[PDB]
Design a protein around this ligand. Structure first.
Ligand SMILES: [Zn+2]
Ligand SMILES: [Zn+2]
Ligand SMILES: [Zn+2]
Length: 68
């Protein structure tokens, strides 16, 4: 599971296609290294947080990056 943490003024990605709930998010590198073509994604601020990439409780497996 990605160990990335970020702060309130750090960009991250939401992906409505991949998420298990509206609060889920993944770090920019995990987004870049995954497959979200034609997904409903948004680069945005998230109030900071921890990456959900690799976490099957938070994020769909098809939305995991190459590295997790
Ligand atoms: Zn996605
Ligand atoms: Zn990540
Ligand atoms: Zn990842």
């Amino acid at each position: 599971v990605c160990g990335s943490v970020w702060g309130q003024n750090d960009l991250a990605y939401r992906c409505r296609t991949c998420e298990h709930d509206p609060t889920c998010a993944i770090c920019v590198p995990c987004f870049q290294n995954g497959n979200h073509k034609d997904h409903d994604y948004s680069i945005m601020y998230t109030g900071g947080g921890c990456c959900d990439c690799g976490d099957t409780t938070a994020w769909k497996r098809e939305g995991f990056c190459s590295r997790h």
